[model samples]
Target: ADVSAAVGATGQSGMTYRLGLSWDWDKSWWQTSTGRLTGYWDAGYTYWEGGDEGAGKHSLSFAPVFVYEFAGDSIKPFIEAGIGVAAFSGTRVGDQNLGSSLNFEDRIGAGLKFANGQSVGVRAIHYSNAGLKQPNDGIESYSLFYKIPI
Candidate 1:
């Protein structure tokens, strides 16, 4: 397995930032001439500056994401998806109600990786309670990210 430092930004209620350390499982399955499947684990801290209806808030999240990379010698294209868990410090982000402090994190993304073990990608992430609680207005974040092996 390999470790990486990740950073990204979010939009919903307010512009937010995130910093994380991740570990790649370095495991794969369903190997073929076109592509292979792999995944990683991420634990991150996210912050929002807040809006008129709320004060600044933050969240913690950990997720396991699976990705499929197309075959290539130098640069490979891939897509990924996953569901995880998150905790918000406060329930309100602007006028947006996140329902509760506990939320489920879902994500989908696409990217490219190079021979040097570096990657750049984009992700669409959602935070919601899945109707488990009231006021599941939800939060969405679209982010661009880069990864470097450690």
Candidate 2:
């Protein structure tokens, strides 16, 4: 498992902190001179602070993130995205009413993997009930994250 930490901000002036673990699939596909595709499983817990709603609340999420890595010598640029499941301990974030404890998590990100197996990235993340329930005002956050292999 690789470890990760992220700091983010919401439009509602809320702050988010997340800690996560990622387990690589240990496989690659679509290999070429330019790039390859790979993936991993990620689990995370995020805490929210200073929000009008759901302040101090938290959520747990898990996803399978697909990554595309461009060619490089031990230092490659990559882009990733995923959609998965999340459960909110508190149904509010900022001023939004997540509507349901069960929601969908979607994210997109890009970064570089160093020769030393460390990575730095930025991500745009969102959570929503997809209209499964009313008032799914949803929530969005932008983050910077770091990861180190374990």
Candidate 3:
């Protein structure tokens, strides 16, 4: 069987999205309450307040994760933190331009995660926008998340 990771994202743009993938490993340098650390990654897009077009950005991030299953069969709460990078695109109001920029990001979140006795899962997560600063602006976000095992 393969283990999966959760994808989560949030943005000040008012649009939210998250997608993630994870896999188990035999060897890991990091250890959590569950077991040795594995690998994880997430990607998504978000939109912000703006003019007729609105503004948005896309992100891709990867991190090594150590997961721990909480007590009980009903809920599992886990916390993860890592570094990432992001890129922004689309046009902003009053600028009359399609803008773009790339910067560093940090990922951190914790929420309730549960499985439905099958290969399915649901989790609520909160993530902070790395507050990445570009040439002219910065970014921030928060979100509720859900995931399925693959």
Candidate 4:
């Protein structure tokens, strides 16, 4: 079992840059001898300054991360996918109009977990209003994170 807190830097194509922080609960939901299915509960905050057309945006997200760790001796490599909900202070950031205050977030990532209680990962995430209202224009972000044991 591993629990950690992480900080991240996120960027999007032609869009704003975001800084985030999250606490992750990493535990095995299922396992074999050397392979395991892990789950993470990640609560994150993301913030960015707007460009010329929109207001600055702040967002809070809660996501569930499902991961599969491959068999390894020292550095365990894994891939993960997640979907979650997010609440934003504004509907527009930079030139992207997200169209709603509430959004759904989806992500996929791969990384290495070292035995020394550290991990590094990169992820791509998509945020959309999910047709709850008009204009379901979505935004995507790419991010990197470092985790340190709690």
Candidate 5:
């Protein structure tokens, strides 16, 4: 995947960017072929800047997904999940440390793959919060991953 730039959204609440890596499994399946193994470190800067206008903050997560290959085609569809730790730096908003944060929501999601049988491709996916309580909030996002296979 693109190691330089990526974009994401959180719990229908915030927008941010991320970067990660992906790989495929070279095997055959019953209908077509075996799926791929995509692992990545997705991270970005997000803000809860409303009635809670805190300082700019972000998190880093390592996510891995498993997907199924399509029938006789390069357009493979898959589902994946991950669990990782993140820390929000110390930030204050109205006597509250918004950054008094902790690691949470190492979650997962499902999406599709567009493979032109090339080294580079695109991925469309959705992620859900792993139900960890960080001041009672979760993260959800629709991401487009640009893949650079090794």
Candidate 6:
């Protein structure tokens, strides 16, 4: 298991914070050309305030995410991506109305993982209703994250 925290500015250019946990599916890593790859199930909670068009909002999400590390490097560089389910507390973010609580969560990130089992990363998180309902405007947050083993 791992725990992570992130903070960044988003939503009408306002600030946001997120807390997350993930469980690794494989205890061992799989080798790749440049390095190794691993996967996990991730869940997160997010909170944000101080936007021009909307009040504060909160959200939760579950996603299947993967990471790939460059091999034989002192500082491991990795890329990550995931698509998952999310639910929101409100439909508004900044000037956009996201339509519903049920939303799709998509994320991509890159960072360095230290040999000491610590990492720092940056992520682009996007949420939308996926046209499940009308007015499916989307919201996005960019965050800097730090992770440690638990």
- Give the Cα lDDT of each candidate: 0.81, 0.90, 0.44, 0.72, 0.43, 0.84
Cα lDDT tens digits, model 5, 1-150, are 334344554443555555554444444345434544444444433333222444445544444434444443665555555555545444332223333355444444554444654322333333222444334343344444444434
lDDT winner among the candidates?
2
Q: Judged by lDDT against the true structure, how good is candidate 2?
A: 0.90
Deviation in angstroms for 7 in model 5? 2.3
**Model 5 alpha-carbon drift over 4 Å, by segment:** 1-5, 23-51, 91-100, 116-134
Encode model 2's per-residue lDDT on 1-150: one tens digit a residue. Answer: 899999999767688899999999989999999899999999999987746666577889999999999999889999999999999887777778888989999999999999888899999999998899989988887999999999
Of the pair 1 and 5, which is ahead by lDDT?
1
Check candidate 4 and list the clashing pairs.
Answer: none
Off by over 4 Å in 2: none
Which prediction has more favorable TM-score, 1 or 3?
A: 1
Clashes of 5: 3
User: How well does model 4 score by local distance difference test?
Assistant: 0.72
Model 2, TM vs. native: 0.96
Error of 1 at 94 (Å): 3.7
Those runs of model 6 whose alpha carbons end farther than 4 Å from true positions after fitting are 27-30
- List ranges where model 1 is wrong by over 4 Å: 1-13
**Cα lDDT of model 3 overall?**
0.44
Return whichever of 1 and 2 wins on lDDT.
2
lDDT of 5 at 124: 34
Q: Write the per-residue lDDT of candidate 6 for residues 1-150, one digit (tens) a residue.
A: 889999977656778899999887784477857677777899999987746657888889999998777875557888989999988887776666888888999999999988877789999988887788779888889999999999
Question: Model 3 misses residue 85 by how many Å?
Answer: 1.5
Q: What 10-residue stretch in candidate 4 is worst by lDDT?
A: 1-10
TM-score of each: 0.89, 0.96, 0.54, 0.81, 0.53, 0.90
What tens-digit string does per-residue lDDT give for candidate 4 at 1-150?
344333433344444344444455656767887689986776767765665546667778888888898878779898999999988888886556778979998989889988886778887878888787667667766777677666
